Amino acid sequence: PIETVPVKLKPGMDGPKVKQWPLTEEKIKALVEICTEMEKEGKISKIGPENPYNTPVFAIKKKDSTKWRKLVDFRELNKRTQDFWEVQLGIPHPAGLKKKKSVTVLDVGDAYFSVPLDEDFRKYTAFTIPSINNETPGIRYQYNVLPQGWKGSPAIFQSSMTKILEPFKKQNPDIVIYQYMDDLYVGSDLEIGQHRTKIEELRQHLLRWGLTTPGYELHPDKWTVQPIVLPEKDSWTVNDIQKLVGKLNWASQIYPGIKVRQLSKLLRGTKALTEVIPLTEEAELELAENREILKEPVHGVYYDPSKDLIAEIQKQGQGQWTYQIYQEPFKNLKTGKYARMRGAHTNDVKQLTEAVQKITTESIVIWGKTPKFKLPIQKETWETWWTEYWQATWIPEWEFVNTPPLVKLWYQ
Amino acid sequence: VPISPIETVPVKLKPGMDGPKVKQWPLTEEKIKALVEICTEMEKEGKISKIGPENPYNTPVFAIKKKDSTKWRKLVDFRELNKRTQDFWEVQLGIPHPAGLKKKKSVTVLDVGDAYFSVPLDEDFRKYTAFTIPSINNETPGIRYQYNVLPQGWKGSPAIFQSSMTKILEPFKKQNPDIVIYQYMDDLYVGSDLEIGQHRTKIEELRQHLLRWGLTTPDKKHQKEPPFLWMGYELHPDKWTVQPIVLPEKDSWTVNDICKLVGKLNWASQIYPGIKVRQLSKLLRGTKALTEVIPLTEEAELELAENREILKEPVHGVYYDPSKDLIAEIQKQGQGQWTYQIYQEPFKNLKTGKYARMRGAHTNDVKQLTEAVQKITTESIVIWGKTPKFKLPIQKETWETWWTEYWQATWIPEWEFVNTPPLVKLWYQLEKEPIVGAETFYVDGAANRETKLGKAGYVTNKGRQKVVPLTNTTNQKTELQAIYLALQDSGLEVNIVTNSQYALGIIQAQPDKSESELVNQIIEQLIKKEKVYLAWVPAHKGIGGNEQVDKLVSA
RNA sequence: CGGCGCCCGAACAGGGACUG
DNA sequence: CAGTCCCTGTTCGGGCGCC
Ligand SMILES: Cc1ccnc2c1NC(=O)c1cccnc1N2C1CC1
Numbered sequence A: 001p002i003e004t005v006p007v008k009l010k011p012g013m014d015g016p017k018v019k020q021w022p023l024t025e026e027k028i029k030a031l032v033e034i035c036t037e038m039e040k041e042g043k044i045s046k047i048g049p050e051n052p053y054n055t056p057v058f059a060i061k062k063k064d065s066t067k068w069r070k071l072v073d074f075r076e077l078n079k080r081t082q083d084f085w086e087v088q089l090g091i092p093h094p095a096g097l098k099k100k101k102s103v104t105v106l107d108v109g110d111a112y113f114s115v116p117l118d119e120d121f122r123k124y125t126a127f128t129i130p131s132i133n134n135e136t137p138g139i140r141y142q143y144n145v146l147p148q149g150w151k152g153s154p155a156i157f158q159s160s161m162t163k164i165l166e167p168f169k170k171q172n173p174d175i176v177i178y179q180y181m182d183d184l185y186v187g188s189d190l191e192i193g194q195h196r197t198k199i200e201e202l203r204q205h206l207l208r209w210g211l212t213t214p215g216y217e218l219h220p221d222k223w224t225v226q227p228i229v230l231p232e233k234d235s236w237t238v239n240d241i242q243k244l245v246g247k248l249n250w251a252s253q254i255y256p257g258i259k260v261r262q263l264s265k266l267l268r269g270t271k272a273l274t275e276v277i278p279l280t281e282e283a284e285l286e287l288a289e290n291r292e293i294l295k296e297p298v299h300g301v302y303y304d305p306s307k308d309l310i311a312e313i314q315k316q317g318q319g320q321w322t323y324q325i326y327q328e329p330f331k332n333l334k335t336g337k338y339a340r341m342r343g344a345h346t347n348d349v350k351q352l353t354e355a356v357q358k359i360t361t362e363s364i365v366i367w368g369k370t371p372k373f374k375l376p377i378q379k380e381t382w383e384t385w386w387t388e389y390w391q392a393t394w395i396p397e398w399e400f401v402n403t404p405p406l407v408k409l410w411y412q
Numbered sequence B: 001v002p003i004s005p006i007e008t009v010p011v012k013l014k015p016g017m018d019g020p021k022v023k024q025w026p027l028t029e030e031k032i033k034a035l036v037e038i039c040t041e042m043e044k045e046g047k048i049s050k051i052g053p054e055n056p057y058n059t060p061v062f063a064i065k066k067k068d069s070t071k072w073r074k075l076v077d078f079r080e081l082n083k084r085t086q087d088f089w090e091v092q093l094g095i096p097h098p099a100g101l102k103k104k105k106s107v108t109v110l111d112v113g114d115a116y117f118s119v120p121l122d123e124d125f126r127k128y129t130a131f132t133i134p135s136i137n138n139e140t141p142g143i144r145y146q147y148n149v150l151p152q153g154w155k156g157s158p159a160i161f162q163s164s165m166t167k168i169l170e171p172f173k174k175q176n177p178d179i180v181i182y183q184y185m186d187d188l189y190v191g192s193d194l195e196i197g198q199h200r201t202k203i204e205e206l207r208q209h210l211l212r213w214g215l216t217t218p219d220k221k222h223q224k225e226p227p228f229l230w231m232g233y234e235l236h237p238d239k240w241t242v243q244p245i246v247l248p249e250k251d252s253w254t255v256n257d258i259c260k261l262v263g264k265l266n267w268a269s270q271i272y273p274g275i276k277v278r279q280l281s282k283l284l285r286g287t288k289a290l291t292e293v294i295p296l297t298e299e300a301e302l303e304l305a306e307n308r309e310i311l312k313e314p315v316h317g318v319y320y321d322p323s324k325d326l327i328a329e330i331q332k333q334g335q336g337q338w339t340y341q342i343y344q345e346p347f348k349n350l351k352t353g354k355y356a357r358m359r360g361a362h363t364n365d366v367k368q369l370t371e372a373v374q375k376i377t378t379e380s381i382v383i384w385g386k387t388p389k390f391k392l393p394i395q396k397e398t399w400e401t402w403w404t405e406y407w408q409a410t411w412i413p414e415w416e417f418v419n420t421p422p423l424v425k426l427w428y429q430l431e432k433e434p435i436v437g438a439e440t441f442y443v444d445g446a447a448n449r450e451t452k453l454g455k456a457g458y459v460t461n462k463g464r465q466k467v468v469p470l471t472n473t474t475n476q477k478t479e480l481q482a483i484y485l486a487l488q489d490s491g492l493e494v495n496i497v498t499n500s501q502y503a504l505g506i507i508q509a510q511p512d513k514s515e516s517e518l519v520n521q522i523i524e525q526l527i528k529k530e531k532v533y534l535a536w537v538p539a540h541k542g543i544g545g546n547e548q549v550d551k552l553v554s555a
Numbered sequence C: 001c002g003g004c005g006c007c008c009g010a011a012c013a014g015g016g017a018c019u020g
Numbered sequence D: 001c002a003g004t005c006c007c008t009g010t011t012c013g014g015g016c017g018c019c
Helices: A025-040 A075-080 A082-088 A109-113 A152-156 A158-171 A192-208 A238-254 A261-266 A281-293 A348-367 A379-389 B033-045 B079-083 B123-129 B156-175 B196-211 B255-268 B278-283 B298-312 B365-384 B396-405 B475-488 B501-508 B517-528 B544-554
Strands: A044-046 A057-061 A068-072 A102-107 A127-129 A139-143 A176-180 A183-188 A310-317 A320-328 A331-338 A372-375 A397-400 B106-111 B180-184 B187-192 B228-230 B233-235 B240-242 B327-334 B337-343 B349-355 B389-392 B415-417 B439-448 B453-460 B465-470 B493-498 B531-536
Touching: A025 A044, A025 A057, A025 A068, A025 A127, A025 A139, A057 A127, A075 A082, A082 A152, A102 A192, A109 A152, A152 A158, A158 A176, A158 A192, A183 A192, A238 A261, A238 B531, A261 A281, A310 A348, A320 A348, A331 A348, A348 A372, A348 A379, A379 A397, A379 B365, B106 B196, B156 B180, B156 B196, B187 B196, B255 B278, B255 B298, B278 B298, B327 B365, B337 B365, B349 B365, B365 B389, B365 B396, B439 B475, B439 B544, B453 B475, B453 B544, B465 B475, B465 B544, B475 B493, B475 B501, B475 B517, B493 B544, B501 B517, B501 B531
Parallel strands: A310 A372, A372 A397, B327 B389, B389 B415, B439 B493, B493 B531
Antiparallel strands: A044 A139, A057 A068, A102 A183, A127 A139, A176 A183, A310 A320, A320 A331, B106 B187, B180 B187, B228 B233, B233 B240, B327 B337, B337 B349, B439 B453, B453 B465
């Protein structure tokens, strides 16, 4: 018996009508035992054909966890409430969160299950638990409490959260606390022992305030940026100068003071690719002036709050992957590289899945926003397994690309 | 007062809308006098009512015909009401595949009578039902009425039926965990691993539970009928098969004959292994009229032949045994056609199938295999909810070379090698580094957009040149064309420098087949070489023999 | 009248390169 | 800077197969 903040699908658009994708029996079982238990708790309840709305659901285990977590893909719903949450209630994003020697992510989403949900909105949380082989029809529910992974859920719980936290925040003013969807980011410059202790302490806070919390540590102060770099060479084959000049031409799409002119003249005749050509000095100086123009920061790159972030991922081989975050071509807010992730040397889709998750995480720690991915993968491939390797409680936005590599040379 | 059978569904209306009013459109004259009476029948059973003032609602009649009936069936058209009624989440999500069924000792089928008329319509929506249709010809102006149950051709009839039915069966199911029911339309199929009599026990005890809600199940019902006939399937508790397929032997071949033919072949392909539709699918390419005349080629007939011999002997699928692993083994059938079998105990198949689909302008066998494996995983999840172990005609080294080199993210799940030629191979590899002491060809091609005219040629470190004039071409084709030249005129090892990003993209993805004859030729030359290193440089940067080439070709 | 499987033909996104 | 083309690559409306 408490109020309910009415919520509306922003103007003109209807509830999500999206199809449930086939699930593995493993996951269908886990969902069945979770929803039947959640029905008993009156968190959710059964629905009829009079509700023509659907959101997809599946299940995951978080990293190093043997427990099945239910996960709803609320992206379409999240878009029409997108306007609800974005225009009505804001969360100021700490620019300092990124500077902490440590940042832990605690999953507080369970708390959202306290609060009731506006009775008029509930028909939009509709989800089907599918059946193997279409043997039964689907088991359909809708949400009674604040549904996990919806953006309205952390929005509406904002007040209550700031409350439950205010003792700790007040007692510990120097610790930074951010909240992104079902996750709460807590970070500090404390030496790691006492950090982990302050995290246990916060766990206690929400534990005694009526919350449960099913490592999470990050190290943002150590996050490195991948600069573009031209090789250091003794002797240059024709082929070396060629790869150099072409790479240099791309880089000059990013950094305009680059000139290929004298190195180009270096390539002048028709010479064997493997012939060793000495570097004229005028070109040698053009090249050195280039390595220089390549250690500076790119003019006019700054984050703009209104624009969406875009992340591009390239597969570099032998377990390495490079990425770039940007809002406008050639102006990159960040570039980076990953290697020896889980799946390295055996499963590309696993590795990429991992990559998309680490990129999203830094994107949230840095701008408090998830990027839109350009994924180097076939559509169908990705849809099939990505559902298998996902350890995150959120789901970025993505589209699929084919780019035979001339941009691959974000790496040696 | 009428009476109240089973829980009702809250059907609403599309906001800001109200019931329809329409004029009649023609329907055959003899049978419709019958419904005037039939309507009075329903009055007494509870399926109809009427009021004079209260209905601003009227609906017409338009129909579709069905074969095989020994008595006539009445009908009404709500199509205007339909368009005006709320949408539902549809209950028929598609059908189970026979190969996905677990083997059941005992399997029966109860057929529900008065199925649609056994379901209460939403109280308040009842109002919207009113309709009118011609007596025999006509005499007096008429009268009208409303529906108290699920009306024919209405959207909620199927959705709400299915759901209500489900709700009823639920307590029976919960009180009977080891029975197994499946609902298709108005038929229920029940099965158990229990003994034959306790099985018929629960069959009546369930006709009880269905009756308690008013659902009538007669005894023309058959335990002595299985195989059950369902959607082209024949189903025995132990084994399933497709219903018998008739392949036309007709001497006269129209493209529509080949069409029906193909459709029959694919449907056969779920069970009879090794079906090839390729050449038959080739006939269908780009035809204006469905009535056109087409002859059968020797290939299409040799295919039709091998297929006729596959269909000759009969065959049956087994069912799934959850205790045992699933196995999917794929064999390359050539001409970018693939077949796979999914079984558990060796030589006993759950099902078979083809993957023939040619994806992309230029492709290769590894890619196509990867695709089939993906298709198959999907099919396996829908049906058995798990991924099979895969048996594939590809060396673990072949594959490792491919997936690890390719620029895209790519994967096959847990799988092992099967030496079952043809084995899938990569027919050439490009070098990762320039080849010492190989001639180096700088290549170019160019064409003029207006005249559609151009030339393709090259220059080398050895002094060797060539320029070939070409007619009716494009910029891309000339750049391919130049690479082709460098291949033909070069020795067993060669470095080729191209400034065509396009051509480089194609060759670098190592195609073994192409729609494009020129690419096919490039491929053939590529396969003949010992070492080929292919490189890219930017145009008009004044590079190398490319500035020199550029002048000669661009001239 | 309707879903699914497939084949066939048309409209939009990415990229290249030319017209001063 | 607009406006032309040439390639490649998914989405949507047209007939068979199964109800
Ligand atoms: C057509 C059909 C569709 C779905 N399931 C069944 C059936 N009917 C069967 O013939 C059947 C046969 C064998 C095992 N299960 C069957 N059953 C399941 C009920 C035990």
